Amino acid sequence: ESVFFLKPWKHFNETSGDTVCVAYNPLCEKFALGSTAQDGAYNRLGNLWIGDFHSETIQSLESHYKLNQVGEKEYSTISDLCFSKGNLFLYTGAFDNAVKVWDMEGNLCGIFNAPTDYIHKLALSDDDLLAVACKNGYGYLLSTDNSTGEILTSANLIYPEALEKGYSASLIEFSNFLGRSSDKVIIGYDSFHTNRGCLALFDASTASFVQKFNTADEAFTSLYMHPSQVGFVASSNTLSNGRVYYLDTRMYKVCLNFTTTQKDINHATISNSGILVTSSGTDNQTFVWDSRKPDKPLSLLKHGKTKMAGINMAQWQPKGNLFVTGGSDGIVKVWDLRLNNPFIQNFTEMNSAITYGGFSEDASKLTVCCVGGDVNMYSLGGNKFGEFRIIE
Ligand SMILES: [Cl-]
């Protein structure tokens, strides 16, 4: 389990805002950091960075922004980002309503301006097709030139009944049963005109609506695909308690459901073993279920008193079996659900509530962020944190 071997590597805080997304490129040679706006705050640099692991350098990008009430541009929250499968480009989404495409030197190569409200989520297919979930209730599918980054095609993913109800598209994932079927696009909806929403499926090659998944209208908060791609979980908030659904990728049917007393679910997952399901909430704890006895929780994994939104980091160690969660006590806790007491150890402690945490797919990196702009990077490289050197 690589997590024991990860040692502090780099610390960074030039951040305007809180860092709320991190990405690694397929090769795990470069990473990118997106943070929020801060409404009254000075931010020369921020909120969009690209770093390089070999050179230990980092560069601030032109990013997303609007002109504030003084005529002086202010940065817009980065809502998602992901590196291209060809390793040349970075795709970003923000609260300026735009999808942008950047090359590895920070040059803007492409832009999608059709959306009329905040971008909320991005997903990327095996063939580098980009799915976009927009606050206006539309999803979009975008293709990009492999060598130039220019946006080549777009397609609207429209679920008219959701749109009638004024829902926002806020979650999005591709699905193809590990390459054994054609690409479908799952979209999760929620409602800011206020706990309603829904979960729908689209065909990606035709860009057409296929079905509503069989749940009540509920605000979906999180989507997680098992690494085997045999199934995924989706969590929602309801008028009362929260719910988690387990959905099969052959039938595209709801197979199992769990209920929790958590009133706001931030993240649901499935274990790497494929058998456990988790729900981490604003209550600063994670409920866990054995899917073969879904009646009652198997365990309850608690964090401590807030340093100040509860659990903002929840991931299984890639390639391993340990579960890792980060909460508003500022602690990253390590758990083994196969032990009678699952708590293993505190991995680290940050100066304030955790805002994001994520492993690289090759398990060689862990990045953890907290309120106030701190970003800690841990690597299989040892006692103290170094710095990146900022470049232009
Ligand atoms: Cl269904």
Side-chain angles (χ1 to χ4, degrees), residues 44-152:
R44 208 230 319 184
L45 311 175
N47 53 342
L48 181 62
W49 302 73
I50 298 191
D52 183 280
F53 289 134
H54 173 51
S55 66
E56 312 191 353
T57 60
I58 199 182
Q59 182 191 352
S60 180
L61 300 184
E62 158 163 49
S63 196
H64 304 245
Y65 55 88
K66 305 165 173 181
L67 303 337
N68 73 1
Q69 280 135 221
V70 179
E72 301 296 293
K73 88 189 213 188
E74 264 194 309
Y75 287 97
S76 311
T77 296
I78 301 293
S79 61
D80 214 350
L81 32 69
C82 50
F83 281 95
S84 165
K85 299 311 193 168
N87 288 276
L88 284 183
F89 301 103
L90 176 68
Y91 307 123
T92 60
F95 284 8
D96 68 339
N97 304 357
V99 184
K100 294 173 178 188
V101 179
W102 315 87
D103 68 26
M104 292 307 92
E105 319 131 79
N107 296 314
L108 182 76
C109 300
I111 183 167
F112 185 60
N113 281 322
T116 58
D117 208 345
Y118 300 166
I119 307 306
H120 281 164
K121 210 76 179 56
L122 296 175
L124 195 59
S125 80
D126 291 343
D127 289 345
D128 207 51
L129 191 61
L130 181 70
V132 186
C134 177
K135 194 169 176 170
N136 66 2
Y138 286 64
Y140 305 93
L141 294 176
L142 303 176
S143 78
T144 62
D145 192 283
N146 288 4
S147 72
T148 78
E150 174 167 14
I151 300 290
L152 295 174

Side-chain angles (χ1 to χ4, degrees), residues 211-215 247 251-254:
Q211 77 182 40
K212 186 190 205 179
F213 287 93
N214 187 27
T215 75
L247 299 100
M251 310 305 278
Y252 286 105
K253 170 150 144 221
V254 166

Side-chain angles (χ1 to χ4, degrees), residues 75-325:
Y75 287 97
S76 311
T77 296
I78 301 293
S79 61
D80 214 350
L81 32 69
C82 50
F83 281 95
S84 165
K85 299 311 193 168
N87 288 276
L88 284 183
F89 301 103
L90 176 68
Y91 307 123
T92 60
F95 284 8
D96 68 339
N97 304 357
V99 184
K100 294 173 178 188
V101 179
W102 315 87
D103 68 26
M104 292 307 92
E105 319 131 79
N107 296 314
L108 182 76
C109 300
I111 183 167
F112 185 60
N113 281 322
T116 58
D117 208 345
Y118 300 166
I119 307 306
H120 281 164
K121 210 76 179 56
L122 296 175
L124 195 59
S125 80
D126 291 343
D127 289 345
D128 207 51
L129 191 61
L130 181 70
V132 186
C134 177
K135 194 169 176 170
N136 66 2
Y138 286 64
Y140 305 93
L141 294 176
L142 303 176
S143 78
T144 62
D145 192 283
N146 288 4
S147 72
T148 78
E150 174 167 14
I151 300 290
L152 295 174
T153 71
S154 68
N156 293 341
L157 304 172
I158 297 174
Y159 176 9
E161 288 83 354
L163 288 164
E164 288 175 21
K165 292 173 168 176
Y167 291 168
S168 289
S170 297
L171 307 164
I172 209 160
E173 306 279 333
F174 284 100
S175 178
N176 64 20
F177 187 39
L178 205 59
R180 297 179 280 246
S181 192
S182 60
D183 281 15
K184 309 295 176 161
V185 180
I186 303 155
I187 303 188
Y189 300 81
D190 58 15
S191 54
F192 294 81
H193 293 169
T194 177
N195 277 344
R196 328 286 286 211
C198 60
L199 189 69
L201 194 69
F202 288 81
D203 179 69
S205 52
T206 61
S208 55
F209 180 79
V210 167
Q211 77 182 40
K212 186 190 205 179
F213 287 93
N214 187 27
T215 75
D217 273 29
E218 302 167 350
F220 284 76
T221 59
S222 161
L223 294 184
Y224 179 103
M225 177 73 70
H226 196 260
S228 74
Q229 310 178 4
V230 306
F232 64 104
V233 286
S235 64
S236 65
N237 296 339
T238 78
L239 298 181
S240 21
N241 65 293
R243 279 173 71 84
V244 186
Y245 304 92
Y246 175 79
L247 299 100
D248 179 86
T249 282
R250 292 161 293 156
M251 310 305 278
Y252 286 105
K253 170 150 144 221
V254 166
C255 279
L256 311 161
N257 65 78
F258 310 81
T259 66
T260 175
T261 49
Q262 297 165 296
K263 73 210 202 144
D264 197 340
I265 302 182
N266 289 341
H267 300 287
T269 76
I270 302 162
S271 65
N272 291 336
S273 61
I275 298 300
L276 307 178
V277 171
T278 74
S279 172
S280 311
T282 67
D283 59 355
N284 224 24
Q285 61 196 8
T286 296
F287 284 80
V288 184
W289 293 273
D290 175 343
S291 58
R292 301 163 303 178
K293 296 174 173 152
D295 304 341
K296 310 276 183 197
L298 160 64
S299 191
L300 176 37
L301 317 174
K302 291 169 157 178
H303 279 246
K305 335 306 216 309
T306 178
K307 276 189 157 191
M308 295 312 280
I311 307 297
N312 278 328
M313 164 184 192
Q315 287 196 351
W316 298 83
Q317 156 101 72
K319 305 145 66 138
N321 290 306
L322 291 180
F323 183 58
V324 183
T325 66

Side-chain angles (χ1 to χ4, degrees), residues 8 303 313 325 329-334 345-350 354 366 368 376 378 385:
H303 279 246
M313 164 184 192
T325 66
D329 51 354
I331 310 286
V332 175
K333 288 178 172 296
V334 181
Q345 70 170 44
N346 289 346
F347 178 72
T348 190
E349 170 169 6
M350 288 199 75
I354 297 300
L366 173 65
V368 180
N376 292 352
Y378 305 79
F385 295 105

